[PDB]
Amino acid sequence: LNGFNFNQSVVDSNGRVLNTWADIINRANLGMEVMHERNAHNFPLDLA
Amino acid sequence: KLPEAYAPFSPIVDVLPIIPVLFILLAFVWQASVSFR
Amino acid sequence: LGHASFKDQEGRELFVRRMPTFFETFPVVLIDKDGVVRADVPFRKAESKYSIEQVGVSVTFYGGELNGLTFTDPSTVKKYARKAQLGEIFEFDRSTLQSDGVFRSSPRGWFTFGHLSFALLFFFGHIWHGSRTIFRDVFAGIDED
Amino acid sequence: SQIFGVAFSNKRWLHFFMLFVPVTGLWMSALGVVGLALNLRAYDFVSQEIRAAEDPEFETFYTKNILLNEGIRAWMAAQDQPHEKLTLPEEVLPRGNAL
Amino acid sequence: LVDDRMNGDGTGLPFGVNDGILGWVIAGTLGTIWAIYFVSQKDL
Amino acid sequence: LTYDELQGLTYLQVKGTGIANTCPVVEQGTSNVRELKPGDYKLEKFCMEPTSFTVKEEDAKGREEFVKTKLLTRLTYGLDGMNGSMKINNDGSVEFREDEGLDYAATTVKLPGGEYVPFLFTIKEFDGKGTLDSFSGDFLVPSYRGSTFLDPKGRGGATGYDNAIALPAKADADEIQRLNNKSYTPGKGSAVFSVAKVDTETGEIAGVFESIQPSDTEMGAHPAKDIKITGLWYGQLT
Amino acid sequence: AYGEGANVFGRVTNKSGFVPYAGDSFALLLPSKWNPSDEKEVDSIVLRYADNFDAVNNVYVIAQDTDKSSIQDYGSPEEFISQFGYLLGRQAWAGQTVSEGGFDANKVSSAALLGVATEKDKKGKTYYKFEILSRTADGNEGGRHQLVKATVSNGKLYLLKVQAGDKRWFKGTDKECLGVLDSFTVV
Amino acid sequence: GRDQETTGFAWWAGNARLINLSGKLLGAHVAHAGLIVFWAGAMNLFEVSHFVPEKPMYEQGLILLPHIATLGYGVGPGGEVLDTFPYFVSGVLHLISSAVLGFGGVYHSLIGPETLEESYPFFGYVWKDKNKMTNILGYHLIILGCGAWLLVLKALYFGGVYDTWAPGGGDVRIISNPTTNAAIIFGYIVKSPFGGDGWIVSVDNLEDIIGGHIWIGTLCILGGIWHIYTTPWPWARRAFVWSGEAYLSYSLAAVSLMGFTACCFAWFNNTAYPSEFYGPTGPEASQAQAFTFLVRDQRLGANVASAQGPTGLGKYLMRSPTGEIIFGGETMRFWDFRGPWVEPLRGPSGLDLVKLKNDIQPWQERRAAEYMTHAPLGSLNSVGGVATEINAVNFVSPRSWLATSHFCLGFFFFVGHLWHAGRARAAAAGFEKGIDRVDEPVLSMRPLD
Amino acid sequence: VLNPMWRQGMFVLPFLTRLGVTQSWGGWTISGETSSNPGIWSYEGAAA
Amino acid sequence: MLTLKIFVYTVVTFFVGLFIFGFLSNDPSRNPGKG
Amino acid sequence: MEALVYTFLLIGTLGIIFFSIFFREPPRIA
Amino acid sequence: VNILGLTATALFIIIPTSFLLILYVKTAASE
Ligand code: CLA
Ligand code: CLA
Ligand code: CLA
Ligand code: CLA
Ligand code: CLA
Ligand SMILES: CCCCCCCCCCCCCCCCCC(=O)OC[C@H](CO)OC(=O)CCCCCCCCCCCCCCCCC
Ligand SMILES: CC1=C(/C=C/C(C)=C/C=C/C(C)=C/C=C/C=C(C)/C=C/C=C(C)/C=C/C2=C(C)CCCC2(C)C)C(C)(C)CCC1
Ligand SMILES: CC1=C(/C=C/C(C)=C/C=C/C(C)=C/C=C/C=C(C)/C=C/C=C(C)/C=C/C2=C(C)CCCC2(C)C)C(C)(C)CCC1
Ligand SMILES: [Cl-]
Ligand SMILES: [Cl-]
Ligand code: NA
């Protein structure tokens, strides 16, 4: 069920994403995510 | 969607589920009205 | 060992992006004069576009024990770029003291750490003793009346 | 005493202990943050790093966390420290497999 | 096969009983405790 | 169990029993072996089931033998469902090829003394020449780990840091075997197969097999041990 | 302190998901959320944009220079795409690996050409349009889809490449990638 | 109403003032039942008003329409929705019945008799009247057995229910010959709850479901008659505590167990909770991703039976620890998953190689691709995907919503069971208000604890 | 042969070996063979 | 391994039976309260 | 060597726990 | 390191333990 997902929530009048502290947290989460179980994933989605 | 005859009652339909929350709040309203005796 | 100048096959001069102070580890990136990344040591050596092998980077040393020498093999260009990430490149005797290859702190850093820790602990001590002075008559307890 | 083995017998001492534990913990954490101000971190266990460098079988949760921290830094730096102006190509970003 | 296993994981065995001696020892232990409690029943 | 009875059983009946790791065992027919009609058959439903794993070890006194191990990775070592071609000759000679299928199984055995030995039990690309009584040949042994495999410090082949980066002044030429080079060279293995219990009305054959293959070399960091796998095997012709 | 009123109850702005970009002798639609990037993996790149989410989803416009009168002089779509494999990215692995699985021999990268097509335009321009799925031994994001739309104009070879992740592709970046692809007009 | 002066209970425990008022307690109960039926009807009408026919209902945030569809109303093959009038009728009937129940509850709470004992001795009770307690329990057991038999009658004669295991993608089916075998029925309840067994959550066909409902209905009727005509035995009288709070605590423990079990049903079971209506389970979606990538790469050739992962274990296919051919990768943890789109591709040794090479059906392909794209992962502000995903998809699985809500409810009701069981014991023993200060037990005990 | 226990400062190891404990859980035997079934009463077993 | 399973089943059954019949042994009567 | 130190420290902590439980100064009610 | 950490740990164990034992034994003899 996960925590609040506010990634790319704020966009400008032209629709360009305005990054927030949530987006910085998302970058950190991506850093953890692409590294955990570095050899255990054969498919892109982390469904299991 | 609702059936066609009941289509103009969807605005009523969209409010009904919050009424249990309204009931648990109405209990506190009644208790405040009796000053939590 | 001397300054290390990096060049590609096209002949433009490249510079290793230096490691910032925060980073324990830093990727090796070679950037041109105008701020464009031109080479790197990739983490993913497949469908890569900027590896030392692909770009053809050589390194020439000036002024040190390798002055005038030019290296073109990627296995040595990679290690010299990784050393140039840390700034000027030096040779180190590690057998004398059995150095573990991990950076230590300077005496000014140790001094600062010790004195900042002592400064906070002494702030607490000053609070405690000002409290003891002002509240001496109630140190063993309150008057009960 | 009959549940946990020990109990307070002194009310005084108990209230103080309740004062003492969080204040001591926060002061210890403040000293640690002071250490971090100078990048004097407890980052690595050098013996385990040596064993991992000399042995490709040796994996611990500490080594896993070192890998995770490397991923955090690499994927966070460009957006988190704009003054560094890091235009890192994706091929230098540490990644696992497929994911 | 290179080694022997009970091979009982899964398969929906009742109480995980892959050999009837297990059901018998369960019933015997429970019945022994029950019999002790039952003969010592009008007691506190 | 026979192949017909195995097909008669359902997945819910086989699940959790271990039979799914077992070769079919033919119960009819004779051990005449030369009764089998010479020809050019297409091998299909080739299956191999180990019955023992032994690892070549040298004693302190100098004696080198094959010692018994304990299997660690459970019932995952079966090779089955492979396809190939078998040319049986009139004089009694056979040419044997394994083309494709589930012809590899990663398997770890524990040596007496507590050492883990991983190895890829494989039979792929096996070219066995010989007779009905016994035909011997070689097979490819792929690298245990792919080039995209990452070590605990994130060093690999196709991927990786290429050096120990947690040690910014230690990753040097004295540990070139660990970091500066990662090797994934394929190896070779030897196998001798013997045929017995042939059903010539259903075109199926049983037998025993004897393979010797190297272990994992990490990624070039350690010399490989030799594993002797004895076991049974089953196949259907054409 | 320059008085300009806020937009309260002001209907909508442009939410089309695309922005028009007119470069030098070309015009194309960019995804609304993508940020421009100064990276030039090919030295003859005049445009690059990348997704705010990940830099795997990118797009670039090569201008370059050509001697053929038209892209039809490149023989065929297949012969035209056989000469741009360096757009894929050179395999930097040099050790022999037959243990990667469905990757031939010593290979950790593969390119399946899903389709080749010829698209002729209103002004007389003819475009070569390419769906390519590149997959690696680790297989990042389940492979990357490359979208190429190229033509020869003036005396140069204009080419558009759009790279997306397969995970992003079934997440729903396929719509915006095809919108970028089908809007590439050079003339 | 009452006050703390006359009851000893503050306003925040004011419902405790209803403990020994039978009529007002009945009124609170009937008003509450009206509230439950009100939420059922109102939520049903909300869901049908917000329902969109072309989209799957699990993409629309619906939890009651999947239940009614699983009952076999307004749905056809593959669970395609044919009509929403049954769902509308269900909602309307609940709303009107809730009006009636609300009138009854308000009446008995406000102007009904305060205690039922003096004027209505059939409904009058004291909590220590064990015979009357078992009488009420017996009546309710009979009612529950009749409800289970209503489900049985629906499945047997009144249109059947939706079988997701029907050949071709599932359909509404009449169950003929339900499994009435006692060994099969009661092997579910003594099965272990761990992986590959799953206790009662692993019930995988409508025959077992309907046969177990025949069993539970008949047992409930028989136990209801038994408790009408019996008195609790002396061992039960010694073992239990006989008070309203104690009975409440027993029910709280029971419904906490039921809530945890319902959480597990919503998360794992795809028979009573068909994936066509509830979305795929977690194991279902992971196996669907593995199957989709397998069929894609085998359309591209690539020899999926021999392809090897970076670890060396098998990219698409591998072995279970018991030897079955299973999908490779982390979805090995979900190798025990069984689903209608994958069971025809399994033989006795697991995933059959030639069947997986040649017998892949287009409906299986479509269903697996859909279930891969609609995995039960999302944020609580309803952003579909993993936590790193951007705001593009507005989706959270109904299975996820049900499992999360009902684990929370089961845990709080376990806590309430602890609270009320302890308070019932302390009140029966006489020290629920504190230590007497003149007969303190510890002060009469030998020291050194 | 050239590095026996008495060359290595072993003091209680000879007293274990004297009365019959000759195998270890490390897979070796004091006489130089391989111990595949050291049993409970190995050197480490006696220590434990 | 079957001997170990038999022993563990016996031990668990013994302790569970002790628990069950201990709370069956008039437990609401074992308290220092009045009543 | 270091494993010995870790095990000794843990066992000594558990011994201190054992003594603090069973050989505590008894709470005297007077 | 292997032995300087060893003597550091031994001293940090023993010297405060010595101090505590001195004070405790003095107290327990007093009472
Ligand atoms: C079938 C359910 C049930 C029943 C019939 C009762 C009945 C009783 N309880 Mg209760 N109780 C239960 C469940 C039950 N409880 C559970 C689940 C818990 C919580 C863990 C408790 C905890 C408990 C306590 C702590 C106390 C009672 C008490 C009482 C008595 C007075 C209640 C009152 O006036 O509340 C009046 C109502 C309120 C004050 C409102 C409470 C506000 C709640 C917390 C709002 C929560 C809403 C939230 C959004 C829900 C979502 C959370 C989660 C599901 C995600 C009454 C006899 C009292 C008692 O012992 O009396 C003798 C007492 O003090 N109970
Ligand atoms: C599920 C909700 C629920 C239920 C059904 C009850 C039921 C009861 N409460 Mg209450 N109560 C609740 C939750 C609930 N409460 C909560 C959350 C709290 C914490 C604030 C309390 C705290 C509380 C206390 C402090 C007391 C009770 C008492 C009572 C009883 C007498 C009520 C009375 O005289 O009110 C009088 C109230 C009014 C006259 C105001 C009007 C209320 C009506 C019923 C509103 C109905 C609206 C509805 C739409 C009508 C539709 C009718 C038809 C068209 C369908 C009654 C049986 C009392 C008791 O024990 O009596 C002896 C008492 O002292 N309760
Ligand atoms: C809502 C359900 C309900 C409720 C709450 C009651 C309540 C009661 N029953 Mg029961 N009962 C019911 C349904 C119900 N029953 C039905 C459906 C039947 C028909 C089968 C009966 C038949 C029945 C009999 C024959 C008797 C009662 C009696 C009792 C009383 C004490 C039972 C006891 O000590 O429990 C606690 C139970 C035990 C300490 C041991 C019992 C053994 C267990 C519960 C049987 C199941 C074991 C099995 C392994 C469980 C598998 C599932 C599990 C793994 C989750 C109590 C008032 C007794 C009484 O006093 O009657 C006058 C009595 O002897 N019951
Ligand atoms: C079941 C109990 C038991 C067993 C069978 C063992 C077994 C072992 N111990 Mg021992 N041990 C035990 C308990 C036990 N111990 C206890 C209780 C202690 C503490 C006192 C020790 C302390 C200990 C030490 C300190 C040592 C061992 C060692 C040994 C090993 C070699 C024994 C050896 O050489 O002894 C030889 C024993 C003797 C030569 C003693 C002979 C008895 C004398 C001669 C008796 C003389 C007086 C007598 C009353 C005269 C009788 C008069 C006559 C007329 C009857 C062996 C594995 C050794 C080793 O290598 O392990 C680390 C060793 O160093 N043990
Ligand atoms: C203001 C205080 C201060 C400062 C800043 C320095 C700074 C320095 N000294 Mg120094 N020194 C000091 C006072 C200080 N010292 C005093 C009081 C003594 C006498 C005991 C020494 C004795 C001394 C020696 C003999 C040596 C140094 C050396 C060093 C240098 C190496 C880095 C270092 O300190 O080791 C690393 C420092 C630490 C790891 C600090 C530990 C962090 C805290 C104290 C731990 C918290 C307490 C903890 C609960 C203890 C439990 C551990 C237990 C389990 C074992 C550095 C320049 C070394 C050197 O290079 O010599 C030329 C060296 O060998 N100094
Ligand atoms: C895995 C296989 C085992 C599964 C066992 C499950 C089936 C049998 C258990 C169901 C019993 C129903 C519980 C009702 C009584 C509960 C409380 C009680 O106890 O109430 C107690 C009550 C108080 O009088 O007693 C009474 O009225 C009589 C009530 C007890 C009657 C059953 C006695 C056990 C029968 C076999 C015992 C053989 C005993 C000796 C074995 C020695 C072997 C060496
Ligand atoms: C006791 C009490 C309480 C509680 C109360 C209650 C709970 C009540 C209730 C009640 C109820 C429970 C009610 C209900 C109701 C209902 C109604 C009143 C209805 C109706 C109807 C209508 C009119 C409808 C219509 C429609 C349809 C038919 C369909 C379409 C749509 C629409 C919707 C329109 C409180 C806490 C407060 C306080 C204390 C006292
Ligand atoms: C419908 C269905 C089904 C069926 C089911 C069933 C049939 C169930 C049941 C069941 C049962 C049949 C149950 C029972 C139970 C029991 C319980 C749950 C119990 C208990 C106990 C207790 C709680 C006790 C306690 C105690 C003791 C221990 C002693 C004394 C004291 C006291 C009392 C406290 C199936 C799955 C097939 C299918 C699907 C659906
Ligand atoms: Cl990890
Ligand atoms: Cl995976
Ligand atoms: Na990974």
CB atoms within 10 A of CB L25: 10
- Gap between the Cα atoms of G186 and H8, Å rounded: 86
Residue H235 near ligand 3, beta carbon < 6 Å:
no
The residue among F156, D91, F174, F163 whose CA lies nearest residue C85 is F163
Lookup: tokens for H288: 């669907």
Cα D96 to the center of its chain, rounded Å: 22
| Cα torsion through F15, F16, F21, F27, rounded to 10 | -70
Strand, helix or coil for residue C100: coil
- Give me the residue label for tokens 């009982």: E8
Can you read off the two tokens belonging to residue H8?
Answer: 């000893």
Give the Cα separation of H364 and H287 in Å (integer).
12
Task: Locate E29 and state its tokens.
Answer: 């232990």
Whether A2 contacts chain D with CB within 8 A: no
Flag if E2 and F77 touch (Cβ within 8 Å): yes
Q: Please state, in angstroms and rounded to a whole number, the distance separating the CA atoms of residues C25 and D43.
A: 12
Q: Would you say the CB of residue B13 lies under 6 angstroms from ligand 7?
A: yes
SS3 per residue for chain H:
CCCHHHHCCCHHHHHHHHCCCHHHHHHHHHHHHHHHHHHHHHHHHHHHHCCCCCCCHHHCCCCCHHHHHHCCCCECHHHCECCCHHHHHHHHHHHHHHHHHHHHHHHHHHCCCCCCCCCCCCCCCCCCCHHHHHHHHHHHHHHHHHHHHHHHHHHHHCCCEEECCCCCCCEEECCCCCCCCHHHHHHCCCCCCCCCCCHHHHCCCHHHHHHHHHHHHHHHHHHHHHHHCCCCCHHHHHHCCCCHHHHHHHHHHHHHHHHHHHHHHHHHCCCCCCHHHHCCCHHHHHHHHHHHHHHHHHHCCCCCCCCCCCCCCCCCEEECCCCCEEECCHHHHHCCCCCCCCHHHEECCEECHHHHHHCCCHHHHHHHHHHHHCCCCECCCCCECCCCCCCCCCCCCHHHHHHHHHHHHHHHHHHHHHHHHHHHHHHHHCCCCCCCCCCCCHHHCCCCC
Secondary structure letter of residue K26 according to DSSP: P
CA J19 to CA H259: how far, in whole Å?
25
- Residue that the structure tokens 């329902």 belong to: H51
- CB-based contact H224:H140 (threshold 8 Å): yes
Token look-up 């009310």 returns D11
R_g of chain D, CA atoms, integer Å: 22
State whether residue F188 sits within 8 Å of chain G by CB: no
Please name the residue that has the structure tokens 């989803």. Answer: G57
Instruction: Give the residue from B21, F49, C52, C20 showing the smallest Cα distance to D85.
Output: C20
**A39 in F contact zone (CB under 8 Å):** yes
| Terminal Cα distance for chain A, rounded | 14
Q: Which residues does L15 contact at the CB level (< 8 Å), separation at least 6?
A: none
| Residue at C74: amino acid letter | P
**Residues near H348 by beta carbon (within 8 Å), at least 6 away in sequence:** F6, F7, F9, F10, F11, F13, F14, F19, F20
Residue F92 backbone zone (phi > 0: left; psi -120 to 50: alpha; other: beta): left
Distance from CA of H98 to the nearest CA of B (A): 12
The 8-class DSSP code of residue K4 comes to H
Q: Which residues pair with F44 in a beta bridge?
A: F83, F236
Contact yes or no for K1 and L2 at CB 8 A: yes
Interface-testing mutation among B6, B9, B14, B16, with chain H (most H C-beta atoms within 10 A): B16
CB F55 within 8 A of CB F70: no
Phi, psi of G134 (to 5 degrees): -100, 130
Q: Which residues contact E38 (CB under 8 A, 6 or more apart)?
A: none
- Residue F98 CA, chain-centre distance (Å), reads 12
The residue whose CA has the least distance to atom 29 of ligand 3 is H232
Residue count of chain F:
238
C-alpha of G32 from chain center: 16
Note the resolution in Å, 1 decimal: 2.4
* Token pair listed for G98: 């037959």
* A48 assigned binding-site residue: yes
Q: How many residues does chain H have?
A: 449
Which of G72, G106, G116, G108 lies closest to G88 in space, CA to CA? G108
Cβ(F42)–Cβ(F101) under 8 Å?
A: no
User: Is the distance from CB of H227 to CB of H145 less than 8 angstroms?
Assistant: no
Burial of B18 (0-12, 13-18, 19+ CB in 10 A): exposed
* Experimental technique: cryo-EM
Distance linking the first and last C-alpha atoms of chain E: 57
Dihedral pair phi/psi, residue H136, rounded to 5°: -65, -40
- C partners (3+ CB pairs within 8 A) are D, F, G
Q: Does H293 touch chain A (CB under 8 A)?
A: yes
Token pair of H325 as six digits: 């051919």
Determine whether the interchain pair G91/C51 forms a contact, defined as Cβ–Cβ distance below 8 Å: no
Domain span at residue E20 reads 1-44
Q: Are G134 and G109 in contact (CB under 8 A)?
A: yes
Inter-chain residue contact F140 with G98, CB threshold 8 Å: yes
Whether the Cβ atoms of residue H59 and residue H81 lie closer than 8 Å to each other:
no
Give dist(CA G118, CA G75) in Å, integer: 12
Tell me, using a 6 A CB cutoff, whether residue J23 lines ligand 8: yes
Q: SS3 letters for chain G?
A: CCCCCCCCCCCCCCCCCEEEEECCCCEEEEECCCEECCCCCCCCEEEEEECCCCCCCEEEEECCCCCCCCHHHHCCHHHHHCCCHHHCCECCCCCCCCCCCCCCCCCCEEEEEEEEEEEECCCCCEEEEEEEEEEECCCHHHCEEEEEEEEEECCEEEEEEEEEEHHHHHHHHHHHHHHHHCCCECC
Closest by CA to G126, choosing from G80, G162, G90, G171, is G80
Distance CA H196, CA J6 (A): 22
Residues 6+ apart with CB under 8 A from F124: F98, F100, F103, F104, F139, F140, F142, H306
- Find all residues with CB under 8 Å of F185, minimum gap 6, and list them: F143, F220, G95, G96
- Rounded Cα distance, H277 and H169, in Å: 13
* Residue F221 and residue F118 in contact, taking contact as beta carbons nearer than 8 Å: no
> In the numeric block, which tokens belong to residue A48?
């299991």
Distance of CA G16 to the CA centre of its chain: 20
Per DSSP, chain E holds a count of helices (H) and strands (E) of 1, 0
Chains L and J touch (3+ CB pairs under 8 A): no
Contact H151, H234 (CB under 8 A): no
Alpha-carbon distance H395 to H390, whole Å?
12
Rounded Cα distance, H391 and H373, in Å: 15
L2 touches chain K (CB under 8 A): yes
Cα four-point dihedral sign J15, J21, J23, J27: negative
Task: Please count the other Cβ atoms lying within 10 Å of the Cβ belonging to residue F207.
Answer: 20
Task: Report the distance separating Cα F174 and Cα C98, nearest Å.
Answer: 14
Q: In angstroms, how far is the first alpha carbon of chain C from the final one?
A: 81
| Residue that is written with structure tokens 């603090």 in the block | K20
- Dihedral sign for Cα atoms in the order H156, H157, H163, H168: positive
Is the CB of residue H315 less than 8 Å from the CB of residue F8?
no
CA of A47 to the centre of ligand 10 (A): 8
CA angle C39, C44, C50 (to 5 degrees): 15
d(CA H357, CA F81): 12
Cα-Cα-Cα-Cα dihedral of G92, G96, G97, G102, to 10°? 80
H292-305 core/surface letters (b: 16 or more CB in 10 A; e: else): bbbbbbbeeebebb
Nearest ligand, CA of residue H33? 7
If one counts every other C-beta atom within 10 angstroms of the C-beta of residue H349, the result is: 25
Q: At what angle do helices H130-157 and H206-228 cross, to 10 degrees?
A: 150
Helix axes of D46-54 and D61-80: crossing angle, nearest 10 degrees: 100
- Neighbour tally for K11: CB within 10 Å: 10
Who contacts H227 (Cβ-Cβ below 8 Å, separation ≥6)?
Answer: H134, H135, H137, H138, H141
Tokens of G56: 């795997």
- The closest of G95, F141, H316 to C46, measured between CA atoms, is G95
Chains that touch I (3 or more CB pairs under 8 A): F
Nearest CA in chain D to C18: D84
Residue G129's CB: how many other CB atoms inside 10 A?
19
- Other CB atoms within a 10 A radius of the CB of residue H425 amount to 20
**Dihedral angle of Cα E36, E37, E40, E44, to the nearest 10 degrees:** 140
In angstroms, the CA H187 to CA D28 distance is: 57
CB proximity list for G157: less than 8 A, separation 6 or greater: G62, G63, G64, G65, G66, G71, G150, G151
How many domains, in total, are found in chain E? 1
